[PDB]
Amino acid sequence: SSKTEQVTGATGITQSTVTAPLPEAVSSLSLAPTVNALDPWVYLNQTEVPGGTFTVSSATQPGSVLLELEISPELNLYTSHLFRMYAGWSGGFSLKLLVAGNAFSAGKLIAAIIPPNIEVPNSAYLLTGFPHEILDFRTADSMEIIAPDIKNIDYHFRGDKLGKLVVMVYSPLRSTSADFEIEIKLTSAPLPDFKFTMLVPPIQNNALPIWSIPQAPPYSMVNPRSPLTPVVELYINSSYATCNHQLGRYTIYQGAIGNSTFNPSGAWTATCTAEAGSVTGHPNWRYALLDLPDNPTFDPTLPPVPRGFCDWGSGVKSGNKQHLVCFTGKKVEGGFQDVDTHMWDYGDNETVGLDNTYQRTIYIKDPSLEKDAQYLVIPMGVSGAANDDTVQVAPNCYGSWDYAPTVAPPLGEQFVWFRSQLPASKTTTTSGVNSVPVNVNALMSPDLMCSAYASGFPLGKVALLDYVLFGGSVVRQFKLYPEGYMTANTTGSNTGFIIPADGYFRFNSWVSPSFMISSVVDLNL
Amino acid sequence: VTAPLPEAVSSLSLAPTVNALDPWVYLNQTEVPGGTFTVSSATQPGSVLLELEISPELNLYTSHLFRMYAGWSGGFSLKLLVAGNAFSAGKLIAAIIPPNIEVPNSAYLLTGFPHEILDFRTADSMEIIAPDIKNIDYHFRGDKLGKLVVMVYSPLRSTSADFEIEIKLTSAPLPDFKFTMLVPPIQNNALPIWSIPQAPPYSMVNPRSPLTPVVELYINSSYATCNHQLGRYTIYQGAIGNSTFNPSGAWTATCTAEAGSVTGHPNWRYALLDLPDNPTFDPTLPPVPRGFCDWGSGVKSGNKQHLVCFTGKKVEGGFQDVDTHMWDYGDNETVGLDNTYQRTIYIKDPSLEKDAQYLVIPMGVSGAANDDTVQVAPNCYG
Amino acid sequence: SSKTEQVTGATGITQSTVTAPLPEAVSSLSLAPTVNALDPWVYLNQTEVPGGTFTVSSATQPGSVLLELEISPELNLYTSHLFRMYAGWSGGFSLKLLVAGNAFSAGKLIAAIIPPNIEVPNSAYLLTGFPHEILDFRTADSMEIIAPDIKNIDYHFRGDKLGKLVVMVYSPLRSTSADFEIEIKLTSAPLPDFKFTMLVPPIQNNALPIWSIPQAPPYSMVNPRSPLTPVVELYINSSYATCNHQLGRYTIYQGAIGNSTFNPSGAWTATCTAEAGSVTGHPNWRYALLDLPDNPTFDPTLPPVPRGFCDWGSGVKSGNKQHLVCFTGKKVEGGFQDVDTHMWDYGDNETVGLDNTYQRTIYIKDPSLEKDAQYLVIPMGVSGAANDDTVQVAPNCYGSWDYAPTVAPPLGEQFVWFRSQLPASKTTTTSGVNSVPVNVNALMSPDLMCSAYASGFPLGKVALLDYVLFGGSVVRQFKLYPEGYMTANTTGSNTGFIIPADGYFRFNSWVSPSFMISSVVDLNL
Amino acid sequence: SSKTEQVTGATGITQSTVTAPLPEAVSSLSLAPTVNALDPWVYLNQTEVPGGTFTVSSATQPGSVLLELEISPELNLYTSHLFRMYAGWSGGFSLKLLVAGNAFSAGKLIAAIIPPNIEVPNSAYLLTGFPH
């Protein structure tokens, strides 16, 4: 059906259509042990879909996929909430597009329905082979699509493959103004034939339509990489700072990926079996070896380092020019007789010819080191190193090791880093070492991620959330990926930008990984 | 016409008396007090443009009548007046939120409430019904009420020159609106019209200089913030830090402190400001007198801009000397802190006894930048 | 109505009755904007009530209240889950008692319905004035009570006061066997007249009927009191170890109560403005003062210590005989020149005549301390002190301070403590201090409580949860209070008992604070 | 009543309305010694009012009063001329606004009727309380 209206002033019209490019199959539910009805008011409540919205500009090419949504109870808030109580479901959905159009100049949209186990093409030409509808920007207000439930079974259990709706640009947008854009918004509600089947206790790990984040300012989150210095600032660096293998790597697949843990307090202490021998070059250095509790010394599959023991990094050409710092002490009955400051390398002096690695082979400036003795390691900071670049060195998984992979931000976006400051251990000694002030940056801390590790994440959607700080009102929108990096869209120069650390994170909506943020952080300073 | 939620009519059977309205108060072209807002290309999506409680305050006449009454029951009929144009596109969302439910801060969540999507092309005379949601027979005052919320669903864009859209809202009560229990009109329900007596600014007092008359008004683009304590007021008091309704009497104070001096100058004697009330110096009440000048900023001693004032040694209430003297506001330099109100004052006079009380009357600055420097007041402690 | 059956063997009967000691009022819902129906299968699903069960023994006196449940949607799993989506409700519930009776010897039960805003008496004599039913242990199988919704409004919003059901012993139980007991179990389902009113988005902080706890072994939780030593053991001490004011105090009312925080890493560092003067007794000691960031130095309402800076305790008569340890260093431009070991008291030497306090006044063994100098404090351990008793000293809120209160376990139950071990800083010096190995115990760590800080807790119910460790199967049941202490029922001697720290917490049920655990930990060692 | 037309080229419409935000009272003239009729062609001759016109620009603020005309025989040329010959009068008038509008972009006008001995406000917000 169709319906046309005259706009105010009579300078155009707007259309509102209902279409069924129909598979159109209804199940009798003969094998369902019980058929569970719904509140009649759920069928009359059209809610925004997680995955919408998207914007169309003059630079948007045809053939690029703008939406890809599975037909399931997750399209509506109340069916998503209700579904946690049930075992199966059956029925189609009503999908409504809302086009903020005008008699701009021109352009067309195409929406198509795709059956399960069929690849989605990247051509507007091929989408016309599917059941579809076409729409014009000069007259489009709302298109309602009767999306069917395509299945070869009478009702669903969790884990099936489902049909999809795909939206694409059919003809490019045009207008006199270069800033004119068209925003598409999608809402959904179940069709009257929708039903649930079997009542079961709700799931505690339910992937819910709304994620609630308790008030916890960033400065309270501390710290996978420097767990002795409070977080006080948020950072935005624009030096192509793609994160190599670091600590604090958390994803909602595993918990902690790599040699990371949910208890990083201090700077995790480890010990070494300090055998030694001949050393060329430096005369004061001894080549010790690192022990591995909970990990066998002779298995490449597990990491050859204690869990939580990671960067401060090393391995640069100046690896022997720049030395790390540790509280070192010899092991004796009941504890450690003394705890002193010594220069440690944790690098690639002679034996490996490696880069920033994760041995299993650590070098020290101590000449007093003896073979038959265990020693303590509590890293503190740096000594003689540069700033802001030699802490974020680039290690990775070498050999047959399987660590966290290297990640980069998407084009047009940059990371945001939790930042802390390290004071300098300045000392006047006949024996002892100095230090240098340093800035330390870390990825998402487990205090905020652990909530996501429990609440859940819709599949294929990235969380969009705000950052509300001291009065007056100022909110910055970031995107929290399941892979565990929070990013922001930026414009301007490549300035290193500092953001406060007093504000609560607030969930806003579920968005696709490719979603342009309107709230940009103009890097001008 | 759209009714996102049905309006359940209540038979006021528990009401001691049912008071009827003038039948002509049901003319629906009276503006809604506060029901005005504009949209531009800069307005962000999800921004809240209007949040009105559904009460007799939605109409000019019910707001006047409600001062005579103790109770009320009924809903309202709203109408949208959109001064749109031919080149613009965008959408708004209007939602009804029940009494004891929080307003979300996402348009994604606002779609969970009963709502209507409004397009700028076809929304110039749309009618919305605002219902009365309650579990009681009628309302008293101090209740928790439902709300109407309007937000930007899709931002405003134009195919031509940029244009703003000003939107106004008019209302009239539904036929089931009623009042209850006549009471004298000195109640709450602030009046919908404020009558201001004609008093030019030159006839007003300057709380930060109550001896020089106001001469003009001015606007400065650099002054993006104000942190003053003197001369600040509020209607939803509450209170304001150290601001009086009698600024002239606020500008006299006394001081006293024992021997002492600043490091580089043995000519700057300490002095602790006395309180109009009495100590303890509790960290819950202002440390300085309720009346005091904020003529200072983050200045540091040493070739420094300073403050000028009168001083005089108290003499049994009798005769005391008075002469212009210098004065700096606190040793903020010696504490690693910016200039703040809790620092003890200094007076550039070695001739001062240590057990005496000295008067203070701020009147100017010396060797200092003009307004740009006294515009920024000292800091606080929290 | 009533129904009687003959038991197998014909040595008795069992009764099953339905009764309505009835208020019996039904609402027309005339003022509800919309009436929201329910799935018809929810009315036919009787689920256990959170708050049941309870056991009756020969030692149970009449007049003691065994159950006290409000009539609300929280009695059933599916109405509790559904209610998060709605604004109001209206209707009564069906409550079913299940008595595991026999022709034991004798005894009777009484169940009564109580209107809102009426106090519950502690006499079986007075409960007979309320509408009630009486029941006999020789023939009772199930009693179904039609509990009405007593209200003066047409439908409810969250926050009202509700009617109650109270169960009590009317005549004491008797039998030949001294071990015979009767277990009462309660289930509920809504009556057909039950309805919801208005659809609203679900609450992210919803108090849900099921709490899901992600797998996180105790050793990963570390540590409000010693955040540099991994948790490796669980402890049960029976020396009347009622916890005085400690750190790691978390409740689901506030988050962290007292000067506790969700980021306790390291051993929170603080600094002191080390003024000094004359000191009697010790000639090497100087009386320094503690600074307070984020807290004014001149306000009793806030604590006079940095947040997170707390015990190691002090203040005992041997407070000057037993000294604490800290990494101390003087403050200079860019950091600290040196970081050394010094003996610190943090006690009541001369100036206070206090006990373990939380000044604002700290004493050191350093003679080199100078007035115009900031110094660092990183507590490590003890020196010259006893073990297992001088770390759990008894401080509290003195003066006008408002800190966390002192708590004790209920009669018959004892605390369970997260425990860690501190190595000894042994050193051979001409200047420097030694240490002693110590055991450190802490209350609930924020890693596991933070889940409860988000999921929610039914009001008046304490969580009962298990502890599943390495194979083969061994599970220990503990009770997690909202006040933030986990306790276990114990029998036997007062042995200090050690439990492993490798096992995931598993939620079991909601129980009342007075609930005897059947899985006891017999302290025999 | 209302009436709508399509402009030449069909790029807009124009409206012509008749409205009575009505007090609407008619006198029987029972105490008039004689009732004096008018030429029937005077009722069919719409003449410009002295006091019109006025122009609206982008700089014109709401709340400023642009017209204020008393309802009397002076609104029409022929009743103004005739009235010099008479002692009294009774009856209402038809007032017609002519707007030289276009689909320019936007804007609105408000016209209100005000009874005698009532002050005219300086707010567009308050004019909505009058019939308009």
XYZ file of C-alpha atoms in Angstrom, chain D residues 35-109:
75
model
C -32.626 54.478 12.703
C -30.835 55.885 9.657
C -29.933 53.443 6.889
C -27.013 53.599 4.458
C -26.533 53.426 0.727
C -26.296 49.671 -0.010
C -23.154 50.224 -2.104
C -21.164 51.462 0.898
C -21.177 47.919 2.319
C -19.476 46.641 -0.859
C -16.580 49.112 -1.057
C -13.404 48.091 0.777
C -11.108 51.103 1.185
C -7.624 51.437 2.635
C -7.476 52.229 6.349
C -5.586 55.334 7.527
C -2.867 53.815 9.681
C -1.895 51.040 7.359
C 0.518 50.109 5.898
C 3.544 48.588 7.594
C 6.541 46.588 6.406
C 8.078 43.498 7.998
C 11.794 42.812 7.609
C 14.290 40.387 9.100
C 15.141 43.006 11.738
C 11.572 43.254 13.102
C 11.346 41.706 16.560
C 8.288 39.906 17.949
C 6.448 41.823 20.635
C 6.661 45.179 18.863
C 3.209 46.535 18.004
C 2.845 47.257 14.287
C -0.815 48.339 14.186
C -3.310 49.673 16.717
C -6.647 50.732 15.219
C -9.906 51.601 16.946
C -13.102 50.070 15.577
C -15.110 53.109 14.482
C -16.611 54.854 11.425
C -13.197 56.401 10.728
C -11.899 53.131 9.235
C -13.788 53.641 5.949
C -13.849 56.727 3.729
C -17.606 56.857 3.214
C -18.606 56.119 6.807
C -16.096 58.738 7.936
C -17.662 61.249 5.544
C -21.217 60.222 6.440
C -20.592 60.340 10.185
C -20.242 64.135 10.168
C -23.993 64.315 9.454
C -25.042 62.119 12.383
C -25.080 62.068 16.176
C -24.527 58.371 16.924
C -23.643 55.037 15.376
C -23.761 51.314 16.103
C -22.280 48.282 14.376
C -19.131 46.366 13.577
C -16.667 46.432 10.705
C -14.981 44.019 8.319
C -11.182 44.270 8.375
C -9.068 42.655 5.656
C -5.325 42.057 5.827
C -3.444 41.751 2.541
C -0.085 39.984 2.859
C 2.384 40.177 -0.023
C 3.834 36.817 0.899
C 5.747 34.066 -0.859
C 7.358 30.794 0.047
C 10.142 33.083 1.239
C 11.340 30.905 4.055
C 9.301 31.332 7.178
C 7.588 33.575 9.713
C 4.166 34.132 11.220
C 1.804 36.981 12.065
